[PDB]
Design a protein around this motif. Structure first.
Motif, PDB file in Angstrom:
ATOM      1  N   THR A 137       0.842  -1.179   0.000  1.00 54.55           N
ATOM      2  CA  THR A 137       0.000   0.000   0.000  1.00 54.55           C
ATOM      3  C   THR A 137       0.894   1.253   0.000  1.00 54.55           C
ATOM      4  O   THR A 137       2.076   1.156  -0.343  1.00 54.55           O
ATOM      5  N   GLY A 138       0.344   2.412   0.370  1.00 53.05           N
ATOM      6  CA  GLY A 138       1.093   3.645   0.500  1.00 53.05           C
ATOM      7  C   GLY A 138       1.466   4.040   1.918  1.00 53.05           C
ATOM      8  O   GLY A 138       1.882   5.185   2.139  1.00 53.05           O
ATOM      9  N   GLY A 139       1.322   3.138   2.887  1.00 50.66           N
ATOM     10  CA  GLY A 139       1.714   3.411   4.259  1.00 50.66           C
ATOM     11  C   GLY A 139       1.705   2.122   5.049  1.00 50.66           C
ATOM     12  O   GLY A 139       1.455   1.045   4.504  1.00 50.66           O
ATOM     13  N   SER A 140       2.006   2.244   6.344  1.00 46.81           N
ATOM     14  CA  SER A 140       1.956   1.088   7.238  1.00 46.81           C
ATOM     15  C   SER A 140       0.613   0.378   7.138  1.00 46.81           C
ATOM     16  O   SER A 140      -0.445   1.009   7.128  1.00 46.81           O
ATOM     17  N   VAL A 141       0.674  -0.946   7.049  1.00 42.27           N
ATOM     18  CA  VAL A 141      -0.502  -1.803   7.059  1.00 42.27           C
ATOM     19  C   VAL A 141      -0.575  -2.334   8.486  1.00 42.27           C
ATOM     20  O   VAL A 141      -0.037  -3.392   8.797  1.00 42.27           O
ATOM     21  N   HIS A 142      -1.211  -1.568   9.381  1.00 45.53           N
ATOM     22  CA  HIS A 142      -1.385  -2.069  10.738  1.00 45.53           C
ATOM     23  C   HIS A 142      -2.561  -3.027  10.828  1.00 45.53           C
ATOM     24  O   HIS A 142      -2.591  -3.872  11.725  1.00 45.53           O
ATOM     25  N   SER A 143      -3.524  -2.920   9.915  1.00 48.11           N
ATOM     26  CA  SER A 143      -4.752  -3.673  10.064  1.00 48.11           C
ATOM     27  C   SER A 143      -4.572  -5.094   9.530  1.00 48.11           C
ATOM     28  O   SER A 143      -3.606  -5.404   8.825  1.00 48.11           O
ATOM     29  N   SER A 144      -5.501  -5.986   9.921  1.00 47.43           N
ATOM     30  CA  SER A 144      -5.299  -7.404   9.668  1.00 47.43           C
ATOM     31  C   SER A 144      -6.187  -7.887   8.541  1.00 47.43           C
ATOM     32  O   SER A 144      -7.359  -7.524   8.485  1.00 47.43           O
ATOM     33  N   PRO A 145      -5.663  -8.703   7.633  1.00 47.33           N
ATOM     34  CA  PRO A 145      -6.414  -9.007   6.405  1.00 47.33           C
ATOM     35  C   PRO A 145      -7.583  -9.955   6.653  1.00 47.33           C
ATOM     36  O   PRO A 145      -7.502 -10.877   7.473  1.00 47.33           O
ATOM     37  N   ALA A 146      -8.689  -9.704   5.941  1.00 44.10           N
ATOM     38  CA  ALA A 146      -9.830 -10.610   5.875  1.00 44.10           C
ATOM     39  C   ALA A 146      -9.859 -11.241   4.492  1.00 44.10           C
ATOM     40  O   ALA A 146      -9.362 -10.655   3.520  1.00 44.10           O
ATOM     41  N   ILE A 147     -10.446 -12.433   4.401  1.00 44.02           N
ATOM     42  CA  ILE A 147     -10.488 -13.193   3.157  1.00 44.02           C
ATOM     43  C   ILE A 147     -11.936 -13.490   2.797  1.00 44.02           C
ATOM     44  O   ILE A 147     -12.713 -13.928   3.649  1.00 44.02           O
ATOM     45  N   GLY A 148     -12.302 -13.214   1.539  1.00 44.44           N
ATOM     46  CA  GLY A 148     -13.623 -13.510   1.031  1.00 44.44           C
ATOM     47  C   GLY A 148     -13.736 -14.936   0.534  1.00 44.44           C
ATOM     48  O   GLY A 148     -12.760 -15.682   0.487  1.00 44.44           O
ATOM     49  N   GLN A 149     -14.966 -15.305   0.138  1.00 42.20           N
ATOM     50  CA  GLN A 149     -15.268 -16.668  -0.305  1.00 42.20           C
ATOM     51  C   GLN A 149     -14.581 -17.052  -1.611  1.00 42.20           C
ATOM     52  O   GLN A 149     -14.379 -18.250  -1.848  1.00 42.20           O
ATOM     53  N   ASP A 150     -14.236 -16.084  -2.465  1.00 43.05           N
ATOM     54  CA  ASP A 150     -13.568 -16.354  -3.731  1.00 43.05           C
ATOM     55  C   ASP A 150     -12.076 -16.130  -3.630  1.00 43.05           C
ATOM     56  O   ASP A 150     -11.402 -16.047  -4.665  1.00 43.05           O
ATOM     57  N   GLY A 151     -11.561 -15.941  -2.406  1.00 42.98           N
ATOM     58  CA  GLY A 151     -10.146 -15.793  -2.159  1.00 42.98           C
ATOM     59  C   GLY A 151      -9.637 -14.372  -2.039  1.00 42.98           C
ATOM     60  O   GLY A 151      -8.457 -14.188  -1.694  1.00 42.98           O
ATOM     61  N   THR A 152     -10.468 -13.364  -2.311  1.00 47.51           N
ATOM     62  CA  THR A 152      -9.994 -11.986  -2.254  1.00 47.51           C
ATOM     63  C   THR A 152      -9.504 -11.638  -0.840  1.00 47.51           C
ATOM     64  O   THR A 152     -10.110 -12.023   0.170  1.00 47.51           O
ATOM     65  N   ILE A 153      -8.372 -10.942  -0.766  1.00 52.48           N
ATOM     66  CA  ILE A 153      -7.832 -10.445   0.493  1.00 52.48           C
ATOM     67  C   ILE A 153      -8.203  -8.969   0.637  1.00 52.48           C
ATOM     68  O   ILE A 153      -7.986  -8.172  -0.287  1.00 52.48           O
ATOM     69  N   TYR A 154      -8.763  -8.600   1.796  1.00 51.72           N
ATOM     70  CA  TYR A 154      -9.096  -7.217   2.123  1.00 51.72           C
ATOM     71  C   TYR A 154      -8.268  -6.770   3.316  1.00 51.72           C
ATOM     72  O   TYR A 154      -8.188  -7.487   4.319  1.00 51.72           O
ATOM     73  N   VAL A 155      -7.691  -5.572   3.226  1.00 48.06           N
ATOM     74  CA  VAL A 155      -6.937  -4.999   4.330  1.00 48.06           C
ATOM     75  C   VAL A 155      -6.968  -3.480   4.202  1.00 48.06           C
ATOM     76  O   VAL A 155      -7.019  -2.923   3.096  1.00 48.06           O
ATOM     77  N   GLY A 156      -6.974  -2.815   5.348  1.00 46.87           N
ATOM     78  CA  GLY A 156      -6.895  -1.380   5.371  1.00 46.87           C
ATOM     79  C   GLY A 156      -5.465  -0.928   5.476  1.00 46.87           C
ATOM     80  O   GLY A 156      -4.584  -1.717   5.812  1.00 46.87           O
ATOM     81  N   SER A 157      -5.228   0.343   5.160  1.00 53.06           N
ATOM     82  CA  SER A 157      -3.883   0.870   5.217  1.00 53.06           C
ATOM     83  C   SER A 157      -3.879   2.222   5.914  1.00 53.06           C
ATOM     84  O   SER A 157      -4.928   2.815   6.210  1.00 53.06           O
ATOM     85  N   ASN A 158      -2.663   2.690   6.194  1.00 55.29           N
ATOM     86  CA  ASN A 158      -2.490   3.990   6.802  1.00 55.29           C
ATOM     87  C   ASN A 158      -2.629   5.110   5.795  1.00 55.29           C
ATOM     88  O   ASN A 158      -2.866   6.254   6.197  1.00 55.29           O
TER      89      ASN A 158
END
Ligand SMILES: [Zn+2]
Ligand SMILES: [Zn+2]
Ligand SMILES: [Zn+2]
Ligand SMILES: [Zn+2]
Ligand SMILES: [Zn+2]
Ligand SMILES: [Zn+2]
Ligand SMILES: [Zn+2]
Ligand SMILES: [Zn+2]
Lengths: 80, 80, 80, 80
Positions: free
Chosen positions: D1-22
């Motif tokens: 991403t464009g900053g620290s990734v402090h948040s923790s990734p979630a995974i959808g049913q089709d494999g997509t990874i979601y995570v927030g960034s700074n």
């Protein structure tokens, strides 16, 4: 909410989203985005809620407490 | 607990709630809100516990350790 | 580990515990407490790992990256 | 991403990874490591996303909001 939402949302069996806020409250929100209820604690809720098998919500607070809250927004207990 | 509960609660198969605290302890609490046991680590427990398939509890600490703790509150091991 | 373990452990299907550390590493540990492998990132790993359906481990880092790591400890990819 | 990734990734049913960034964004990434979409919020996303039964993504932000985002990256709603 009324402050930073650092904590991470939990989801109940009927779709309700629960998340704590920095404004000291635990929020219960309906999948349509309207407030279900709000529970008022003594400090910022940084921690993330957990849902038990009966639907009790558990979350920690900066006021030194772990809260247990019924699905209707009334306090069950709080361990200090 | 004795300090801010920043960490997020985990729930066991029999309903026990586990959460770490800033007072350096991992707590095990019964669904009725009475203390089951408390395990004493060398620093604040900001991280959130995980439960393995045999019921081992794992959580990290500020003292540089990942702890493994049996369901009865005795240390299994700690990796530094 | 070599620093504060702020991040929260994830557990794989064969019992392996994964957790990030402040010493910049993602750890993979066996249920008996001996190190499986360690993966070296550019900054503190505050975030908590997730496990996909094939067993890929995903975790974020303070170096601005989301890492994808194979179950054997080799990098899959990292999105910046 | 464009900053620290402090948040923790979630995974959808089709494999997509979601995570927030700074850098203020929620990221949706494909298991092959290429960007699916990015959603732009008013502050750092420290909190970790949750996935509802229809695939709605929920995550909190430092701008005082809990966001609800459709699987295609359009805003559903945001509760303030
Ligand atoms: Zn603010
Ligand atoms: Zn306050
Ligand atoms: Zn205090
Ligand atoms: Zn201390
Ligand atoms: Zn240290
Ligand atoms: Zn460093
Ligand atoms: Zn940076
Ligand atoms: Zn900013």
């Amino acid at each position: 909410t009324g402050g930073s939402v650092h904590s991470s949302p939990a989801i109940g069996q009927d779709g309700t989203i629960y998340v704590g806020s920095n404004d000291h409250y635990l929020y219960a929100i309906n999948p349509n985005g309207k407030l279900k209820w709000k529970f008022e604690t003594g400090g910022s809720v940084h921690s993330s809620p957990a849902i038990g098998q009966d639907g009790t919500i558990y979350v920690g607070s900066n006021d030194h407490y772990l809260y247990a809250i019924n699905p209707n927004g009334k306090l069950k207990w709080k361990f200090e």
